[PDB]
Design a protein around this ligand. Structure first.
Ligand SMILES: CC(C)(O)Cn1nc(-c2ccc3nc(OC4CC4)ccc3c2)c2c(N)ncnc21
Length: 461
């Protein structure tokens, strides 16, 4: 029997997004039609921490585990360059994106969410699997239904793969990490700490450990001190504060277990009178919008650098291929050159096999406006393959800007820039410098186009 090839069984439909350790692609079984979400981990870009057999055994165990609040794993594939982890697709998106879209949110809603998280974590810990990187974006809703169950993603991965050091991969990690993880000695209790921070945020909309940039946040976490002095804590039950305290207990051996947290009075009472936590929802909407804009700004700048890189690479490849020196290539040649560009850049999970490349080239060749067959001008192909991506990138940045601009003022204040660039970990003096060069009127605010220009100048343009 043959070692099984991922693309012999699955075809890619669309990219779902970048997650921790790699892109996730919506795929479909070629025989049965079953849709699945495939996390593809690039061996070049993600180092392993364990030996192959340690990884294999963990995969085999994960395939046997089943819990309603844990992502289901079906299959695992490995080739020369990649690991392919095939799991169930969930369509309800990230929890915090659902929450900001409601008018009411109470401790009852929070308790129901936390109970699910604790139930998942408890099961995973019984089986000796630790998350380590638990955060709001690892909490997916199963479907778009109002009542939908939460599915936790990424259990087991941090044990086997090294985290990215790149800030586009790191936004938001610092708030949630347990202090003991920072110093190196940690166990499954780190996941209770993370859950405690999530709960604190659900009930007030502010992180318990906060600060102006990543390192400032880590400094607060490492000291471990936090308060309930914010006004919005006055609407909150004492039993919720007690559970939080126990979850954010500094010494792990004295911190409550996941299982014990399920039996806590707060969970028992509030999942079995209650105002809406309106101020919390407001603060969550603002926190989420700020996080998503910082992320969008990082992705935009990274996409601009990737485009400078790939544009020149792709031109050199076609120039080499163009044996007539006449600037003309056929479809097969554009395909082979676009393939060679993948034979190095292992960024594009969605170009999974030759068929997906064929399709993408054809979108551009269709897109070559009007079509002459045989003599494609490769310089114009490069422009449109890359302008497509550039246009897409600009539109994604803009969506995030608009969502952040909740008053529809059209502008972001310099106070708000400071918050965004802090979260993006862009140097204060450096963005102020680029703001001076763009804002020569001391308006102390920027419109979208001005913001986009600042980003271009912060990535060498
Ligand atoms: C935006 C996104 C990156 O969270 C997208 N995303 N990420 C995942 C996701 C997340 C993690 C996944 N982990 C897997 O295996 C690891 C061994 C456990 C396998 C598939 C995984 C998929 C996901 C999903 N399943 N359904 C829907 N959206 C999903």
């Amino acid at each position: 029997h043959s070692t099984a090839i991922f693309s012999d069984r699955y075809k890619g439909q669309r990219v779902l997004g970048k997650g921790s350790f790699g892109e996730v692609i919506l795929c479909k079984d070629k025989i049965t039609g079953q849709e699945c979400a495939v996390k593809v981990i690039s061996k070049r870009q993600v180092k392993q921490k364990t030996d192959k057999e340690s990884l294999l055994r963990e995969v085999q165990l994960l395939k046997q585990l089943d819990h309603p609040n844990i992502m289901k794993l079906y299959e695992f594939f490995e080739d020369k360059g990649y690991f392919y982890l095939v799991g169930e697709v969930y369509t309800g998106g990230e929890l915090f994106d659902e929450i900001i879209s409601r008018k009411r949110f109470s401790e009852v809603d929070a308790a129901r969410i936390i109970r699910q998280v604790l139930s998942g974590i408890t099961y995973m810990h019984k089986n000796k699997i630790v998350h380590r990187d638990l955060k709001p974006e690892n909490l997916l809703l199963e479907s778009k239904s109002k009542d939908a169950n939460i599915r936790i993603i990424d259990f087991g991965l941090s044990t086997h793969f090294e985290a990215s050091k790149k800030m586009k991969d790191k936004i938001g990690t610092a708030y949630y990490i347990a202090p003991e993880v920072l110093h190196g000695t940690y166990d499954e209790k780190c996941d209770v700490w993370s859950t405690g921070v999530i709960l604190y945020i659900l009930l007030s909309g502010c992180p318990p450990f906060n600060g102006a940039n990543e390192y400032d946040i880590l400094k607060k976490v490492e000291k471990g001190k936090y308060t309930f002095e914010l006004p919005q804590w006055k609407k909150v039950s004492e039993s919720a504060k007690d559970l939080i305290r126990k979850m954010l207990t500094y010494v792990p051996s004295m911190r409550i277990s996941a299982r014990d947290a399920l039996d806590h009075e707060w969970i028992q009472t509030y999942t079995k009178d209650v105002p809406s936590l309106d101020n919390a929802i407001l603060n969550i909407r603002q926190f989420q919008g700020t996080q998503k804009l910082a992320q969008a700004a990082l992705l935009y700048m990274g996409s601009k650098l990737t485009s400078q890189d790939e544009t020149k690479e792709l031109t050199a490849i076609f120039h080499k291929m163009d044996k007539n020196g006449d600037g003309q290539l056929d479809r097969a040649e554009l395909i082979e050159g676009y393939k060679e560009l993948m034979r190095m850049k292992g960024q594009d999970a969605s170009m999974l096999d030759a068929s997906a490349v064929e399709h993408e080239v054809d979108q551009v060749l269709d897109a070559v406006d009007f079509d002459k067959n045989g003599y494609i001008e490769y310089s114009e192909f490069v422009t449109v393959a890359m302008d497509r991506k550039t246009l897409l990138s600009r539109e994604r940045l803009e969506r995030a800007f608009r969502m952040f601009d909740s008053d529809n003022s059209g502008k972001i204040s310099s106070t708000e820039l400071a918050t965004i660039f802090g979260v993006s970990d862009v140097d204060s003096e450096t963005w102020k410098s680029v703001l001076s060069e763009v804002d020569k009127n001391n308006d102390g605010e920027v419109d979208f186009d001005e913001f986009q220009q600042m980003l271009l100048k912060l990535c060498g343009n």
